[PDB]
Design a protein around this ligand. Structure first.
Ligand code: HEM
Ligand code: HEM
Ligand SMILES: Cc1cc(N)nc2cc(-c3cccc(CCN)c3)ccc12
Ligand SMILES: Cc1cc(N)nc2cc(-c3cccc(CCN)c3)ccc12
Ligand SMILES: C[C@H](O)[C@H](O)[C@H]1CNc2nc(N)[nH]c(=O)c2N1
Ligand SMILES: C[C@H](O)[C@H](O)[C@H]1CNc2nc(N)[nH]c(=O)c2N1
Ligand SMILES: [Zn+2]
Lengths: 414, 409
């Protein structure tokens, strides 16, 4: 436990100094003798004696951020939050604290490369929601607002916080907008192989699937612990980009398209010991997210093969690097399609450059910036981006976005 | 307690027990991960360290507690007493060197670890001897292009003022020169080291691919220059299977990668000079040596000849040019029958190696950050492979550059 930590950029020899790690909260899984850095995931709802210090920690942080630490209002808030916990075992966040918390959960998210945008986030309070129909209303407004006819804007919608654990609000979808995957009796998969499991859940709950290549899944929404309910998102609200290529005329004939709004809805927002199990947030895409992961991953659309077939690449020996050539072209198509349809999207070069600039600024005037190299480095051409050569410290700050069990694995059906 | 690692693309789960055996620290704490940080003895310390190594040696050849084991322990204890150190048997030395490669978390090429030719050079006393051992190493390892893995182990550190050191970072590297205007002729990574040779009276050909002389230090004395006989340096001209102009870039690289500035550590003994060599994974040359900004940096030039539009980043022009360069490199080596491996085959081998190690050994330390190839990452099997990283010994360690310590004489 020393007070300073340094990180070097081995390409630009710049050294930064981390003090912020001292405010780190929970353990990382790593120890003195092992490193879990590449491990993906290394109803105990809080009690009073647990919540007091967590609440106090966050409120102190909030008033520090707005330069009123030790003020009258600061002490009064503490007194109010502490009385509220003593007699309700919980407390509610003011709209300002809630908005602060959201933004800082994003800011604190070590695996996100797009954090340079963090302060610019539209927060939708939906803590007054009581039903699935209402959730759906809020989600539709979130999507229209975030999509903005292609000029995408980051936004989060926050539903009521957990209480006893039996009355949780959840979005069962992993993203608000995903394509269905249908397992076939002959062993193949139609649509998106990633979402096969969730598709069967939807179908079992009553969904009539069109059984197509690009079927937008419905929302599965749980309010206040009740069984979840199905809702079809209005097709006009889902912006989609058909994928084509600046040079390859045949690329359009592959028949691919993708949606514009990446909207993650299964994560959990934790602020001052409060747990918002349902907190969907959206931004715009990095190209490699659709181009490399969504399409080329073996257990995804796997058009790697077919593209290489249409490029007439030698696909008999790997050392021809037919896969790499193919992947690059696919990512060129994705970026070209989104840009043509003036839908917001960022390439992996521009984004990693942005994040380095963000990291430097965070170190300069916040004392550090937690980052996960393993996730920050893009899935293609890593070494020729600035982040590859950049040393990073990884630690967990609160407020944070966390993972949570899939709701179907925990839900007590009514 | 036991730990799992999932491959997410195949859902295969391995259980790690081996990590419980380590005692060297990683640089991480419970609260901070430093997995992307590149670099995070007397009688009294030396016996338990030796005892640890001797034990896992006699456990390795299934004679733990044998007459020999008991005696060998006694022999080593008596020697640390009366000399404040000890000497490794031949067998132990070869076992120890293979196992330092086996324990190399950042090495993707470890499937080959038991195939290692070990050259004992612990009788060496001068730079001239060192030179002789090194030339022999290069001749054997290069093997006319059918490369073979070797290590040459010079005497162990004693008091510290008598270290053996190969000052070159690799046995075969290219000189880099600081130009008058500001740019750099040749390999920029080595510009400091090139000036150290020029200082020693090396006459620089001042060209793009000049092979650097050896700088060798024995028993702590002043390092000395030696030219490597050119017939021993296997080189490859880089050209492209479709593009006719690629050879007009005048590029070429050496066949033998031989890292010579690390420190082998066995049973508490330190070998400050122990050059080891293997063969290349194509991205080491084509992605890092040629395309890094702090290196040969020829992407712009290539993509220019490929007539791509380079005005915006989102055309992925750096990306295209990069692939084409690595195709060339692989084509060039394979055409000259010089052992090389593509990052796809190398990663496949390593997943298989990992599974082997989890079977027969209970684990396999691995640094994901270094194992994942510096291009086309998520289309190699190792991207979706979870990996535990821990510090096993014997190991190869980093050491300071010798010109930062050595008081000249
Ligand atoms: C605005 C543009 C954004 C871009 C370009 C971006 C980019 C990315 C990328 C590429 C990843 C890696 C995930 C993957 O590989 O699938 C990621 C992760 C993540 N992002 Fe961002 N993101 C953006 C906005 C946001 C926003 C608005 C939030 C929340 C308010 C957010 C929170 C997160 C979290 C929590 C993760 C993963 C961390 C974890 O799994 O623990 N991101 N982002
Ligand atoms: C046989 C073919 C081999 C291949 C294809 C190979 C490949 C690689 C690659 C690509 C790296 C990453 C280094 C970088 O990119 O900067 C690496 C690291 C390394 N390799 Fe290998 N290698 C081979 C043989 C060997 C041998 C013979 C030894 C020693 C006996 C060895 C020991 C190491 C060590 C010590 C590292 C750095 C590990 C660390 O810092 O923990 N490798 N190797
Ligand atoms: C808001 C936002 C934008 C974006 N472009 N990518 C995200 C990616 C994620 C994300 C986080 C963890 C895991 C995943 C995908 C699972 N392999 C995505 C979350 C939010 C994102
Ligand atoms: C034996 C061998 C073969 C090979 N193809 N690459 C190596 C690469 C290394 C290595 C280790 C640390 C650092 C470096 C270069 C700086 N990234 C190389 C060591 C040995 C290697
Ligand atoms: C095994 C590994 O930790 C895991 O698959 C991670 C690696 N790095 C990643 N990086 C990004 N951006 N996205 C990912 O899904 C992953 N997967
Ligand atoms: C900062 C970062 O850890 C450093 O540049 C590492 C990252 N991973 C690497 N991986 C390999 N194989 N080779 C490298 O040189 C590096 N560089
Ligand atoms: Zn770690």
């Amino acid at each position: 436990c020393p007070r300073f930590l340094k990180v070097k950029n081995w390409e630009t020899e710049v050294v930064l100094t981390d003090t912020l790690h001292l405010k780190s909260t929970l353990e990382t899984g790593c120890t003195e003798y092992i490193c879990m850095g590449s491990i993906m995931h290394p109803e105990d709802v809080a009690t009073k004696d647990q919540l007091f210090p967590l609440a106090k920690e966050f409120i102190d942080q909030y008033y520090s951020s707005i330069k009123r630490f030790g003020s009258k209002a600061h002490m009064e808030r503490l007194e109010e939050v502490n009385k509220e916990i003593d007699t309700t075992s919980t407390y509610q966040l003011k709209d300002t604290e809630l908005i602060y918390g959201a933004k800082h959960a994003w800011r604190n998210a070590s695996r996100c490369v797009g954090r340079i945008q963090w302060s610019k986030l539209q927060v939708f309070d939906a803590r007054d929601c009581t039903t699935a129909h209402g959730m759906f209303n809020y989600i539709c407004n979130h999507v229209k607002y975030a999509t903005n006819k292609g000029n995408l804007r980051s936004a989060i919608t926050i539903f009521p916080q957990r209480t006893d654990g039996k009355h949780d609000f959840r979005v069962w979808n992993s993203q608000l907008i995903r394509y269905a995957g249908y397992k076939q009796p002959d062993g193949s998969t139609l649509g998106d192989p990633a979402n096969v499991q969730f598709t069967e859940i939807c179908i079992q709950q009553g969904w009539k699937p069109p059984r197509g290549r690009f079927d937008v899944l419905p929302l599965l929404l749980q309010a206040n612990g009740n069984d979840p309910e199905l809702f079809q998102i209005p097709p006009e609200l889902v912006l989609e980009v058909p994928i084509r290529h600046p040079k390859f005329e045949w690329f359009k004939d592959l028949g691919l398209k993708w949606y514009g709004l990446p909207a993650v809805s299964n994560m959990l927002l934790e602020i001052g010991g409060l747990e918002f199990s349902a907190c969907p947030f959206s931004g715009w895409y990095m190209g490699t997210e659709i181009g490399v992961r969504d399409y080329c991953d073996n257990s995804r659309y796997n058009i790697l093969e077919e593209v290489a077939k249409k490029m007439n690449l030698d696909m008999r020996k790997t050392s021809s690097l037919w896969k790499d050539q193919a992947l690059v072209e696919i990512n060129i198509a994705v970026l070209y399609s989104f840009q043509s349809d003036k839908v917001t999207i960022v390439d992996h070069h521009s984004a990693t450059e942005s994040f380095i600039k963000h990291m430097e600024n965070e170190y300069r005037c916040r004392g550090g910036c937690p980052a996960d190299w393993v996730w920050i480095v893009p899935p293609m051409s890593g070494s020729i981006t600035p982040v590859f050569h950049q040393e990073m410290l990884n630690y967990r700050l609160t407020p944070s976005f966390e993972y949570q069990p899939d709701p179907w694995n925990t839900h007590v059906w009514k």
